[PDB]
Design a protein around this ligand. Structure first.
Ligand SMILES: N[C@@H](COP(=O)(O)OC[C@H](O)CO)C(=O)O
Ligand SMILES: [Ca+2]
Ligand SMILES: [Ca+2]
Ligand SMILES: [Ca+2]
Ligand SMILES: [Ca+2]
Ligand SMILES: [Ca+2]
Ligand SMILES: [Ca+2]
Ligand SMILES: [Ca+2]
Ligand SMILES: [Ca+2]
Ligand SMILES: [Ca+2]
Ligand SMILES: [Ca+2]
Length: 318
């Protein structure tokens, strides 16, 4: 069931494509159309093979020459597609923790929606690249319970999915109820432990049983009981337990639906998921917001940026 929209091209020849790319840039001008059409049709691994072929043939750096030729959002999309898939989430979190403040959107979005196995991969790749430890930088930039919830999720140690225990399900449904609605104030430590640590299939049962007991969806209680960064993070975590595709379809829709487009979020979710579950994100987006993701992008973007983004997305209906 989980499926991306970008696959390995059959009859890939790294050497032929690097010559197509050399021609598409040599001279005054840039043929942005040959670049866009070739790269969105190659898998991320293929793009890496191309990049080293281009380097052995011409002794030139593929991504640096593209940076020289291109500009704007389209440059930013093409550079993102060229990041090895192993490094892109690490990349995006370093640049979120970068500068003075911190981009909590980015932190919350990746850390909530990535599985334990993707999170340990991202921590390794981050350390190797940036020479820093991820947990240490996250702690460095955040506070309060938002910080603690991010550190719990960064442990990547959520319980395995196993046979459900109903007595366990109702004990946790009830702890959450006494921890929030029935308390003056909130016991956020109790919400972080059960939401940060219980298995995904056990928590899908907990969220239904909590509805039976209180007449509220856990999302409704999180909005009632918390605010700010912790509220965003706790909602991202619940949404992701329910469906990662659905959560990312929803992230995509708000990056566009307002007046402008949050272009950074739109490039990050299309590129990071192109080879994982972007087909599923298309389905969820159509089913939920009545629009195809293609019409939504086609309406919200322009130029080569738009054309590239659309060959990457790929579906009408979805
Ligand atoms: N979640 C917060 C507040 O959640 P409540 O709606 O129960 O808080 C009422 C008021 O703020 C005094 O605590 C806390 O722990 O203080
Ligand atoms: Ca040129
Ligand atoms: Ca041109
Ligand atoms: Ca440039
Ligand atoms: Ca910072
Ligand atoms: Ca901030
Ligand atoms: Ca801090
Ligand atoms: Ca309360
Ligand atoms: Ca409290
Ligand atoms: Ca709130
Ligand atoms: Ca818009």
């Amino acid at each position: 069931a989980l499926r991306g929209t970008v696959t390995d091209f059959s009859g890939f020849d790294g050497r032929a494509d690097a010559e197509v790319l050399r021609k598409a840039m040599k001279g005054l001008g840039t043929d942005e159309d040959s670049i866009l059409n070739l790269l969105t049709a190659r898998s991320n691994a293929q793009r890496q093979q191309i990049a080293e072929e281009f380097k052995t043939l011409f002794g030139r750096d593929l991504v640096n020459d593209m940076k020289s030729e291109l500009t704007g959002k389209f440059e930013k999309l093409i550079v993102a597609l060229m990041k090895p898939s192993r490094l892109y989430d690490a990349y995006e979190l370093k640049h979120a923790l970068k500068g003075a403040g911190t981009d909590e959107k980015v932190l919350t979005e990746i850390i909530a929606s990535r599985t334990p196995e993707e999170l340990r991969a991202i921590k390794q790749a981050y350390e190797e690249e940036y020479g820093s430890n991820l947990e240490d930088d996250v702690v460095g930039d955040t506070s309060g319970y938002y910080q603690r919830m991010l550190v719990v999720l960064l442990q990547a140690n959520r319980d395995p999915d196993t046979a459900i225990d109903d007595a366990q399900v109702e004990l946790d449904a009830q702890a959450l109820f006494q921890a929030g609605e029935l308390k003056w104030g909130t016991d956020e430590e109790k919400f972080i432990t059960i939401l940060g640590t219980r298995s995904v299939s056990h928590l899908r049962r907990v969220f239904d049983k909590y509805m039976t007991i209180s007449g509220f969806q856990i999302e409704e209680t999180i909005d009632r009981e918390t605010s700010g960064n912790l509220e965003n993070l706790l909602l991202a975590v619940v949404k992701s337990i329910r469906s990662i595709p659905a959560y990312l379809a929803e992230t995509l829709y708000y990056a566009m639906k307002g007046a402008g487009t949050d272009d950074h979020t739109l490039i990050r979710v299309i590129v990071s998921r192109s080879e994982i579950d972007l087909f599923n994100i298309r389905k969820e987006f159509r089913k939920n917001f009545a629009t195809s993701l293609y019409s939504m992008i086609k309406g919200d973007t322009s130029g080569d940026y738009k054309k590239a983004l659309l060959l990457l997305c790929g579906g009408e209906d979805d």
